[model samples]
Target chain A: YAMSNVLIINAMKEFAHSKGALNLTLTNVAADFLRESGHQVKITTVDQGYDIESEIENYLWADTIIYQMPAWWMGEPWILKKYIDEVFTDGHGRLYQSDGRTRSDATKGYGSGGLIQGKTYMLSVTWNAPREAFTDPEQFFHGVGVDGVYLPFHKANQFLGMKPLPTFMCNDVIKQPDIEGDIARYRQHLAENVNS
Target chain B: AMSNVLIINAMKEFAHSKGALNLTLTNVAADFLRESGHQVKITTVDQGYDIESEIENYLWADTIIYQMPAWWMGEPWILKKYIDEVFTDGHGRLYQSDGRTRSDATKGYGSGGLIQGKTYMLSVTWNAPREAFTDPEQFFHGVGVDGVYLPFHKANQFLGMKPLPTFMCNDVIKQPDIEGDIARYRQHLAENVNS
Candidate 1:
């Protein structure tokens, strides 16, 4: 159980709904654990055609944002990419530079000034690759750390004024034998990092 | 040497046949390339899931050109899929088996792998202003054009191919300078490539 206001931005509700039981079980268990912890948890399931403004509002509301999704092509899925495009607006009076300051005076864009400054962001990613693959940098992440693969997202949050936290990766979710234990680990990890 | 270049337009409008302003711009580019004595091929992958054959077209060209609008500082999903399906490790290995070392595979069609020894040029249209992406550090966060293009670059590099300089046409929607832009691209391509 945690004591933080956590916003879980799920990018695969449609797929999970279609896949049925397993996904539901996972999401339910995860959500239930957070609720048990007496934390304020808002779970927003997003699809490809979701409203961008609403999502941005959620981002603004979050004290800590956790992006939970299955990995696709070394990054988030296509639907999640669409969400990023729509939500991370780059115009004047948008995410960043909302104060009417010119580019010369202000930071570049949303996350430019690290907008979510002081706020924490974490990625709860599930990958098809085995846990061993993560250990082998050359075969898995091209000789870079698993954290390095997610530099773009970290940079996005850092630019938006958010403090990027260490990610929670669940390798080979399809093969994890102790389901209850996995959930417990996840909960414990979240509890440790929520406000740390 | 004058090369046979193929420009695959992956923008959504061409597939629907609604005929967008970018289609007209693509036509201008094709015409200019043809007029300069280089053989050119242009195909639109808007009809979803027709990328296997399109990848075949790319495999057949001396130089392959990708022209599209940059969404989220990356290629559109449709174009990205084409890359995922077409440029495979097997394709890379097969080209290497054909007397072409992995490093020099981007040189020519049939002489090496599908993309080895052949140059790739990205001609992107951005709705954002040119200044927005000018500095690699401030704008692209130290990735530069090459960083934004890492996925495509890795695909080619995996097959032992080299990347050429990219060309960007920013402020597309707000600007009406399509003709001049296309003319400039034609000259740029001609000047860089032997063709």
Candidate 2:
């Protein structure tokens, strides 16, 4: 793979006693790795704040986007949602033109209005829940897989017409963290999946 | 189905306008719940909240129903901030830890909820129609409303609360049926909430 413009949206919010040390580390790892791999990388950390127009430009500039987030209440932090609310709305015609449907053409589909057809995204999620909690009917999730838990987020990106790279998750982050092992797998995951 | 209920109306002006539908639904549910002889307390997220007081309300109410719109596919940013502030401050109060121990890390990851008997319900308004969610060939790929709001549900669950059935008003933007939506919502409350 050749050099690519990779944008990473980091949605780690420090709350209570749980500071996002690990996610930040992972973010650094991704940024460093992507940069060293000859990809131009831009990092947007949501909680610190952002500029709407600039974010739109980032979206436009990048060939691939990666969301490095934690599984807070089954989704990304509120700040990231806020980030999208501002940036994506500003991206109206540039990112997406319509709801992919028209009065003239009823079969156009609802989410087909995205302007960026060839771009792709990846989800690198951190979870306090173990891997076993998902994809097990006997578990609390009732057999709903991790991707099932992130359907809304997926739809949001889909609205922009971007495809997906396979997701990478770090489970049991707080309870039974395998820091070295997860990072090793993450590095490998990126090497194989990300075009760098 | 408890007598003491907290109705958090997480509605805020967006795209330069306020949403009357969700506010209307908030009042509707509150009035119905009150008329049914249940004690109710309401909090409007946009108006603001005291972190400690919000925690008190959560502890006082046996049931909580979130009244909000699914803006950009999730709760309004203010509501997310509310959770970030209030729940984080409620570390020892709402939950002690992530419900896991190093000694037995794999055993319990989400079990540290403090308010065990309490429950929550999500009453959301969406610009997307109902069909967009339930149909496999549709936008959501058959992930229903509850599935979309699973993160919100799991948030309350992490704090040791159970769930009641969800209530949603769809196609609230381009197409709206205010009268029918209100009628169905009333019926939903009557069936779900008990004194």
Candidate 3:
């Protein structure tokens, strides 16, 4: 198997409803699997703290990046958003030169100013909403599914010219949890999608 | 002392007055609301807010307006932090539980909202062109402004708040037409809020 450089961000924060135990376990599972598969891994835990320069370096160094987090209020926690605001802003000129559009070029489009073209990223999020809620037309989501709901998150990566790997979602994490089953399924998922 | 309308301007100082549009829109809405006989209160996120006062404002208003800049495909981190603190502080007051019970796990997942019947609107400014949205070949892949802000919508929905039609100001950074966008926003408010 060819080795790949992977950056796994442990983006878990303690909120009123969750202590982030499940997300922590999943992050550990991915880190362990990626390392055992002979992939070079660098882990950054959001709760512990991060430096902007180091984060920029990580984004530049890694071929693949994974964000492991819980779906809070239908999006990322405030901390992750804060991380992006600071780092992405600081990485201007280095990560991306401009908004990809220029004054002279009418054909040039927005979101094209990224320096990281070949890198890929995956969003692994745990949601309290059941899978049926996302897929069922009668449900609140109206069958949009995970990717549809997370389009903004994808666009953030797209802005940097990074391709997307299939998103991983753990549904019904709070009300009805099969933690052990989820762990096993995640391992299988990683082996098939990531290691294969 | 109490107002029927609340407008939160989530504009942070980025370099210079890059966020002027949001503040201008916020004041426009506030003035419109007040002129229409509804008392209005405004909170600027960067100017600071008290978590308790915010909850009170939520309780006081029948309509809340959020004026935020679209940063990194979402609201600025400061605005998100506002929600984090205010909403969490509103545990029993704003929401009781995650609206789930261990007995019937699937019945009510996000129904734990306390302030029902109150409504909210999202007014966002974007550097991306208006054409970038609602077109299949465009950057947003035909997702409208509302679609890009589903998270913000869902956040309000989680609080049992209803949505007024969203107002968007596009191409503000590169090709700014402040007057035109504000004129359109005024019309939007008149149509949506007045009705």
Candidate 4:
């Protein structure tokens, strides 16, 4: 595999003081792992506040964008959501830039307007619900997997024309934290998905 | 038929330099409610929403209305932030697990949903053309507007609110026939909201 650029975004908010924040710990380790694997890695967090232009540059620079987030109500934290809203913009041949949108047919042009056609993304989520909660029919989620529950997220990246990589989930973190196991599985996830 | 309605509008013009069409819809909807003799309390913001006040409005209102532009196939970042902060666990925000919580198997996970009797509606405006989200061969691969809002629906359900069918205003960026859209919006309120 060739050496590649990677961007790690940690979107943990300040007030969420839940025990065993695997989103934080694993993001740091994931960065280190990527760097050690002969790849260029840049890590940014929502609280760190990267500007708009730089964020655009970051998206263009990296082949893969890895969002390591703790699920807040089955989706991204508000801070990360804000960053997505602020960034991921449109222009001439950019992320959301449409090329031949003549309005002759609404679907004809904007359907292929995404700029980052070759890029890919993966979601690493930490959840409080046990893994069984997703598998058991009688469980809280009624056997709906994390990805099924997080469809909007997949579509967000899908809207950008980014290829969907497998999601890495650390379940039961609050009640049954296994950061050790999570780290191992994440490395496996990176090897399989991270394009480098 | 007067109802206590709470309209929480997160209408920041992130890139819409022309004007906030969604905010316009929200404001007009508020007007329609007031004129129809319903009690209205509105929470409007661009950033950093007050948490406690939001929870209060959630409790007070019979029908809660959420208005925001769809940002990246979901609710705007500020709206998500509102949920994260306001729905603080164990404070009786959304999760009622502060004093009498024990096992993971317990129902307080979502069973203690805060406002069960209340109702809610989502009014979403989109910048993308309607076909991009609807047509089978289009960009969204046959996924329509509601298909993109699973998480938002689930969150409202988690908080124990019943859904009034969502109202969508599409093609805002492509073909924003503002006056026509406004009339349609007014009609929408008259039909679903002004009651």
RMSD per candidate (Å) reads: 7.3, 2.4, 2.4, 3.1
TM-scores for all candidates: the values are 0.66, 0.93, 0.94, 0.88
Rank candidates by DockQ, best first: 3, 4, 2, 1
Judged by DockQ cut-offs, is candidate 4 incorrect, acceptable, medium or high? Answer: medium
- The full ranking of all candidates by TM-score, starting with the best, is 3, 2, 4, 1
Top model number, DockQ: 3
Best by TM-score: 3
Clashing pairs in 2: none
Model 3 error, position A51 (Å): 1.0
How well docked is model 1, in DockQ terms?
0.14
Question: DockQ for all models, in order?
Answer: 0.14, 0.50, 0.55, 0.51
The digit string of per-residue lDDT tens for model 1 on B40-98 reads 88877565545456556666677777777765556655665455455432454324433
Of the native A-B interface contacts, what share survives in model 4?
0.58
Q: Global lDDT of each model?
A: 0.59, 0.84, 0.84, 0.74
**Better candidate by DockQ, 2 or 4:** 4
- Tens digits of per-residue lDDT, candidate 2, A1-196, equal 0488999998887875458888898999989988889899999988788889999999999999999998766678878888887887789989988777765544337788899989999999998788877766766677778887777788889889998899999987875678899889999999998954
For the candidates in turn, chain A alone yields TM-scores of 0.78, 0.95, 0.94, 0.87
Categorize the docking of model 3. Answer: medium
Q: What is the fnat value (0 to 1) for candidate 3?
A: 0.47
Which is the winner by DockQ between candidate 3 and candidate 4? 3
